[PDB]
Structure formats: structure tokens, C-alpha cells
Design a protein around this ligand. Structure first.
Ligand SMILES: Cc1ccc(C(=O)NC2CC2)cc1-c1ccc2nc(NCCN3CCOCC3)ncc2c1
Length: 356
């Protein structure tokens, strides 16, 4: 039968990077800072053990408060669960600490991608075929992420990573941790989200993500941001001018009272002609967009339905658009202390088995 009686502890080494100390296993070499954020820093490196170029994220003060602690656990679980080509997955996760008492840091190793969707667009114009392959993968990814009952909630170009051969992976899904002041004003952060989730209407389903995919594809085709609004309200108006104002049907389904109340007061207007906005676009694309850009979430196309759309005919392969196992998110409805979230996280680290 054979069992592993004793696991060997790799030998780490320190070095200062990004004004912060990075202690990692000697397998990872040539660490170079590629970014930062309020969640932790990121370094590109070379994994001599696998010959792969990898991305390493060092969370910053992962257990400094219940809110942080729980999120640190949440991220580890999300990464551990995803195992699909178009979704960022966990290649390794380590901590220099030798025991739960010492435990303070968490490093998450993932694949490395040449760039995010922003960078690419600025570099050149993409062919109708490029858009097809690019959007096709986002949908393959979402199909998989959604099947494990997980919603992204914040899909946008900065979350989509691609590389030289046009291959894409989805990042930062299921995290939904943003303070309202970064989503205020003329900011690209709030230009790709569904109106329902932006102005907190009814509840939202997986289709919030399909609306985002709509805004991205529109952009890749036209070369311009579809709804570049200056604030939540201006943003909503730009959207309504194109898709039209709510209708009795969807209006009743809007759970929020103040919201429902404000929508009513808006002067009404019909759905514009999509062929006149996304011009010079493959006609099949225009059709897919009219099925992605619908105000009512109950009537928005799903990722699996969309893979079946004639536009992705050259890439659609049902015998190769995998689904995930269900994600067990019961922990999400718990209220534990920092040390309890930490302990759970610690367990998830020493129990991680490297992919084949
Ligand atoms: C490590 C990690 C851990 C976790 C998660 C994550 O999503 N967790 C959520 C799902 C649960 C993501 C990463 C991660 C982070 C940044 C990345 N950046 C690049 N692009 C670098 C090239 N650039 C482009 C911009 O300009 C400079 C150069 N490639 C791959 C990356 C992988």
C-alpha cells in the first residue's frame, strides 16, 4: 500500500524585495516584483523544480483582524478548488513558519501570465478571430467557476490574464472585497459590472458575470469602453440609453424598495439598435451581445448556453468544456476568532498536495 511516514521540510532562504522580507523555498529563483496592493505583494520567479515561470503572492498581515483572517482562508480555499485551464489555480502554497505558533505568513504560488487584458488592447487591434478565442475562454472559465456555485462579482480586463499565444486565465474570483470609495467617480473598476449588483437591486445570480463579459467583448470589438460613466448614476444612465429602461416585469422583481423607487422616476426609453453601436462587428457577435446585455438577470444568457452560440463555432467543443465539483462553502457562514481562522488556514497549508 505504501505511506509517507515523514515529510521533508524544504530549505528556505530570505531576501528583501518590495521593502518586505521574502522567505521562500530554494526551488524558487530569480524573484522580481511585479506588483502590489492592499492584499499582498506579487513576484514573478522561476520554479527550478518544474521549469515553469511562476507568480508568487505573499499576503500582507493575513491574520491582523477577523475580516482579513477569514479572507486569507477564503482565498486559499478558492485556489485549492479550481483546477481548470482558463482559471488561475494553485501550483503551491507555503509558509516559512515551523508550527502553528510561529505561523504568520502565507505565500501562494500560481502560473505566470505575460499580461492582463488591459495591456494587450493598448498594444494592438485584435482580429474578429482574436475576440472569438479570447471571449471563448472567458466563458469556458466561467462555466467551470459557476458550476462550482461560485460567482466572480468583479470580472474586468485587469482580472483576465493572457500571454503571447493568446491563452487566458481568470483571476480574483469570489473575493468581492471593495470599499465604496474606490468604486466612486470616473474609475474603470465600476465600468464592467451589472447594474443590479451596482445599485444593489434584487439579489444577483451568476449572470452578473455574463454582463461583464458582455462589456468586455464589446470593448475588444469597438476598441472603446462601452459604459465609461463618471459615477454610479451616470453609469446607470449610459447603460439604460442602450438597453432601455426597466419594464414592469423586471421592476417588480427588484427586491430593494429605494432602488425600485428611483428606477420608476427615470424617464423611459427604448432599446437602441445594437448593429448601430458595435459597428463593423461580426453579425453573430452582435447577436451574442444582445443576449449578454439584457437588464433582467433572469433572462440573460448563461456561460454554458453561450458556448453553444454560433459565434464560438470554431472553438466550441462540448466534450472539452469541463465542470467543477461543488465548492463546500459552509465555513462562509461562520463567525470565528482570528486564531480559529488562522488555525484552519494553517491546516489547509500543511495539507496541500502539489499538482502532478
Ligand atoms: C499569485 C497569485 C495568487 C492568487 C491569485 C488570485 O486570483 N486569487 C484569487 C482567486 C482567488 C492571483 C495570483 C497572481 C497575481 C498576479 C499576476 N500577474 C501576472 N502578470 C504579470 C505581468 N505584468 C502585467 C502587469 O504589468 C506588469 C507585468 N500574471 C499572473 C499573476 C497571478
Amino acid at each position: 500500500h505504501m505511506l509517507e511516514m515523514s515529510q521533508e521540510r524544504p530549505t528556505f532562504y530570505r531576501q528583501e524585495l518590495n521593502k518586505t522580507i521574502w522567505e521562500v523555498p530554494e526551488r524558487y529563483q530569480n524573484l522580481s516584483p511585479v506588483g502590489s496592493g492592499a492584499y499582498g505583494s506579487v513576484c514573478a520567479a522561476f520554479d527550478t523544480k518544474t521549469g515553469l515561470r511562476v507568480a508568487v503572492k505573499k499576503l500582507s498581515r493575513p491574520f491582523q483582524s477577523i475580516i482579513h483572517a477569514k479572507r486569507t482562508y477564503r482565498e486559499l480555499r478558492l485556489l485549492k478548488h479550481m483546477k481548470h485551464e482558463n482559471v488561475i489555480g494553485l501550483l503551491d502554497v507555503f509558509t516559512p513558519a515551523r508550527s502553528l505558533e510561529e505561523f504568520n505568513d502565507v505565500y501562494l504560488v500560481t502560473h505566470l501570465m505575460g499580461a492582463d487584458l488591459n495591456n494587450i488592447v493598448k498594444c494592438q487591434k485584435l482580429t474578429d478571430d482574436h475576440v472569438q478565442f479570447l471571449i471563448y475562454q472567458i466563458l469556458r472559465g466561467l462555466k467551470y467557476i459557476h458550476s462550482a456555485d461560485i460567482i466572480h462579482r468583479d470580472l474586468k480586463p485587469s482580472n483576465l490574464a493572457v500571454n503571447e499565444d493568446c491563452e487566458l486565465k481568470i483571476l480574483d474570483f469570489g473575493l468581492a472585497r471593495h470599499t465604496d470609495d474606490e468604486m466612486t467617480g470616473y474609475v474603470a473598476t465600476r465600468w464592467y459590472r451589472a447594474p443590479e449588483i451596482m445599485l444593489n437591486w434584487m439579489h444577483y445570480n451568476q449572470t452578473v458575470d455574463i454582463w461583464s463579459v458582455g462589456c468586455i467583448m464589446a470593448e475588444l470589438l469597438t476598441g472603446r469602453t462601452l459604459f465609461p460613466g463618471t459615477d454610479h448614476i451616470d453609469q446607470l444612465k449610459l447603460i439604460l440609453r442602450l438597453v432601455g429602461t426597466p419594464g414592469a416585469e423586471l421592476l417588480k422583481k427588484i427586491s430593494s424598495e429605494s432602488a425600485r423607487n428611483y428606477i420608476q422616476s427615470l424617464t423611459q426609453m427604448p432599446k437602441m439598435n445594437f448593429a448601430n453601436v458595435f459597428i463593423g462587428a461580426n453579425p453573430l457577435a452582435v447577436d451574442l451581445l444582445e443576449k449578454m446585455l439584457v437588464l433582467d438577470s433572469d433572462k440573460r444568457i448563461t456561460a454554458a448556453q453561450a458556448l453553444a452560440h454560433a459565434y464560438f463555432a470554431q472553438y466550441h467543443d462540448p466534450d472539452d468544456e469541463p465542470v467543477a465539483d461543488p465548492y463546500d462553502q459552509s465555513f462562509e457562514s461562520r463567525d470565528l476568532l482570528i486564531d480559529e481562522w488562522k488555525s484552519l488556514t494553517y491546516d489547509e497549508v500543511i495539507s496541500f498536495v502539489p499538482p502532478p
